[PDB]
Amino acid sequence: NVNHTTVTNSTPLRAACFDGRLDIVKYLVENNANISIANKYDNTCLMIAAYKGHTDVVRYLLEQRADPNAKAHCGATALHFAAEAGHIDIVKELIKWRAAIVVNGHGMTPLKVAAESCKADVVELLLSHADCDRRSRIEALELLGASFANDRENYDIIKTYHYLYLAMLERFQDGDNILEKEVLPPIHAYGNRTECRNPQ
Amino acid sequence: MDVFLMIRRHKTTIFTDSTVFELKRIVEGILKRPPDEQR
Amino acid sequence: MYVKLISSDGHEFIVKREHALTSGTIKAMLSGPGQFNEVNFREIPSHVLSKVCMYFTYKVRYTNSTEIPEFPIAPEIALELLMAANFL
Amino acid sequence: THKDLLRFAQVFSQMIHLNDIECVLRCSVLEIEQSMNRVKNISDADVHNAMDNYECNLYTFLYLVCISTSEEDQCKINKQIYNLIHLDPRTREGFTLLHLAVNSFPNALVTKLLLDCGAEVNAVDNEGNSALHIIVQYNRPISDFLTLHSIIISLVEAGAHTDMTNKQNKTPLDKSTTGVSEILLKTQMKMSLKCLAARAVRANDINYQDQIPRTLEEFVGFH
Ligand SMILES: [Zn+2]
Hints:
part of a larger assembly; 4 chains; A: about 0% strand; elongated; C: alpha+beta; three-stranded mixed beta sheet; about 30% helix; binds zinc ion
């Protein structure tokens, strides 16, 4: 019980959610549940549910009209938080409820998280529910390939060039609306070449 | 630059893509006629 | 170093030699037992040659992405333009 | 061996991930695949021993050729796949080996070799389906950009019309609804004065009414 628990705003309902037994759904989740808790980085139930790889209780939470909004120490609620989690199923679950999000100033846009994560499939799913500016599409595809050039988990030189060709050709179909690539003079530390702007 | 001349002479046609005199010069380059004559 | 076609109906035309290469049989009958440089294609009306040359020039009008406008569509001469496309 | 042969093939697939041979395993259906066809000829209901055995046929080359992907033995393997060079089994709905290969399986090495050996590039199925008509509609565009590239590039080199029409007026470009396949198509075709002229003639209510040469009729009916 929340009275018989640790000091720092814990709840044995959440501790049971670690186990994930069906007895929780039978007795506690079905009955009244812990309303709200917080911690140092401002954890809420909607976050720890997504973080838990078990999703039947998380889905059941939505089945219980789970609140689609929450906060943490930074501006993250499940689009900045399911991004690095990699659990595509709950990403689709949250898209199912047509939830939205704004940028996180401390971090980046939820789309941009997967760009530096080297993960890819997430972008297409996110773009599906994305009805934002087309200008975002141009710059959201040149960073996914760029990360593959110098990373650790998955290194493949061939995909890097391929993923930038679509990127440039999506900027010349706009009918003399070329959003050119303004560049600073080359830095001697990073070689001596210059960022490319012509198609060839 | 942007050269696109729909030239149409008397029963003669030049699809040639320069001063007006140079145009007559091109006419001389083809019809081989005096530029003033092909004013 | 420019070429000139001869019209069977009586009104031949002078054109650039860049188009001479871009063709089906012009290269064929500009070389051989003849012409080792004007040929009368006697198999066509004169007005068709206007659109033929317009397309010929349109070839270089849009060479090497994305946006390209439409070539001037033949409203009522296409029935004879088709029988001409295969010939050359 | 209706399912037992597929079982040993499964056994071979096992050691594949478990970490002349291929010619001999194919020699299993060398004529058997043809006796399959003969029994289908004998009775129409005999395609029931065969519904998956067309698939399990092309499933084999989905794996035995997959591992296949000496030069004399490789020419032998080409002879082995040369069995249905003209013995083309008309499957249900007219989907050939290429036609099921393109539909998603979604492979490039199998699809390139089946084209390399030789097949009907512009084969038309029931309801006017074309090989390029299927590839454009794909549900995982951004997931793999290195496979659609290979398939689209390989298909056009063999020769297929990019201005084809279905039974109803639906060009392969028109049927494509994905945002990327349109660009990776539009950046490769050639154009001719012939197609641009015939397209309007077919579009116009004016009919040729057999006033054109017969050899020119299937450059207009197709369009
Ligand atoms: Zn065509």
